Amino acid sequence: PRPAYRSRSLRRVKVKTPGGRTVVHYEKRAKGVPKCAVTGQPLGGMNSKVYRFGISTRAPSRPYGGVVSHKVLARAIRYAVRR
Amino acid sequence: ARNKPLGKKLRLAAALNSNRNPPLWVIAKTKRRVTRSPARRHWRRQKLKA
Amino acid sequence: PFSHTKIVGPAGRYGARYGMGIRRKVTTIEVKQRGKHRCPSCRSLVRLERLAFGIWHCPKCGHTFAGGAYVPQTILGKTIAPEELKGVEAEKAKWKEAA
């Protein structure tokens, strides 16, 4: 745990306590947000900051939800209706 | 080291238990023939290869 | 002919090192490499982004295509382009061949 704090994997956060001491808290970085399977851009509705796995994220109310953006879904539906 | 494996720690424990001279009543019992122990060592001088 | 230099241009980052001939070959290539080109798809006169040697991206229409190491289209590459992109010439020839 000391060399583990010499690496920059964790955030170094300096905080003052109610006891008057200034300490360093080593905190996790945010996980990356879900990305569109086509464009790789963050998906709307799910790009909130999350700091651990195992947290349920609600996908937008749309077919294919948090898998592709609305732009990809609409275009793909337009292609299928014709075809 | 701070982070020890138990197997190494138990070998260190054995060396700590054995590092001492014969008791004074042993010296009396043997008419001063037994006064030293081969397990007697100093942490700075005689190094364990633990 | 350049922003602050007479002839060295982009090779000005090398200073007086490596020899005139070497820095001249670099300048000849990089003037085209870092200049403006025409997108093969949208035909806009834009500075295309080179993601890596041989990979070019158009910031206007998003066209991502394979090209030369330092220029988007090599001399021999130009003659064997995909024909889904030579749609302007197919219609130009037909218009001349109809009216």
């Binding site: - | - | 090398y14 490596y18 070497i22 070959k25 670099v26 290539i29 093969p40 798809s41 993601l51 890596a52 040697f53 041989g54 990979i55 066209h63 991502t64 295509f65 394979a66 090209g67 030369g68 190491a69 330092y70 220029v71 289209q73 090599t74 021999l76 590459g77 064997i80 382009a81 995909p82 024909e83 889904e84 992109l85």
Partner: protein, 239 residues
């Protein structure tokens, strides 16, 4: 001790090997592709000599091919005997018309592609000899060979041409390239060593060596190896 550098390379030490874990996978034809596919990505692969295209077939099979010059993301390509000879299409060699520039040419069907894979290279389809299932192609070196007519090639030239025309201006630039390749960088001349380390090592005025025969054993077979000739006269006789 005394084994010279070329002899130590064959042991496959880490400094002589290819760091192929830096790449996504081999750039080869799968044995059973057919139909239409889509170019879904075009990528730089460390240590390779050309950009690589990721192609997704209709049945979901993905494979890597060297990107033809002009190929673009989202392009629809066709694989098989029915495919028109358009750039990026993968065709059996017996179906490709003569005079067509092709690349990533299989020598036998299913070997994945062997010839004309470096950036800017291509092979020319010279003739067809279908009574024995052979196609005649000219390779980038100028050599004319026969290949299995059922083997696959891609239409066009390999993208990324012109890379070697720009000088590696600094030692450091080639150093970074070498780290993605297998080359040992840098190299020491033989005559810069002592005799124990090279046939050319030694004398007060160090010299190169005269050519060795083709039968020379390893550790002796350095310098010119059974060369037909040397110098400008050899080039003139080559022509």
């Amino acid at each position: 001790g005394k084994r010279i550098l070329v002899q130590r390379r064959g042991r496959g030490g880490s400094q002589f090997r290819s760091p192929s874990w830096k790449r996504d996978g081999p750039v080869r034809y799968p044995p059973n592709i057919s139909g239409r596919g889509i170019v879904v990505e075009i990528l730089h692969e460390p240590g390779l000599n050309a950009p690589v295209a990721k192609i997704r077939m209709e049945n979901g099979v993905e494979f890597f091919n060297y990107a033809a010059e002009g190929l673009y993301v989202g392009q629809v390509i066709q694989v098989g005997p029915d495919a028109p000879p358009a750039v990026g299409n993968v065709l059996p060699l017996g179906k490709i018309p003569e005079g067509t520039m092709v690349f990533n040419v299989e020598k036998r069907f299913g070997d994945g592609g062997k010839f004309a894979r470096s950036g800017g290279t291509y092979a020319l389809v010279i003739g067809q000899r279908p009574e024995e299932n052979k196609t005649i192609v000219r390779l980038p070196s100028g050599r004319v060979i026969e290949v299995d007519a059922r083997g696959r090639a891609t239409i066009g030239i390999v993208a990324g041409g012109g890379r070697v025309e720009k000088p590696f201006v600094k030692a450091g630039k080639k150093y970074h390239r070498a780290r993605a390749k297998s080359w040992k960088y840098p190299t020491v001349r033989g005559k810069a060593m002592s005799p124990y380390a090279h046939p050319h090592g030694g004398g007060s005025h160090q010299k190169g060596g005269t050519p060795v025969p083709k039968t020379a054993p390893p550790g002796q077979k350095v310098g010119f190896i059974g060369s037909r000739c040397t110098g400008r006269g050899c080039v003139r006789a080559r022509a």
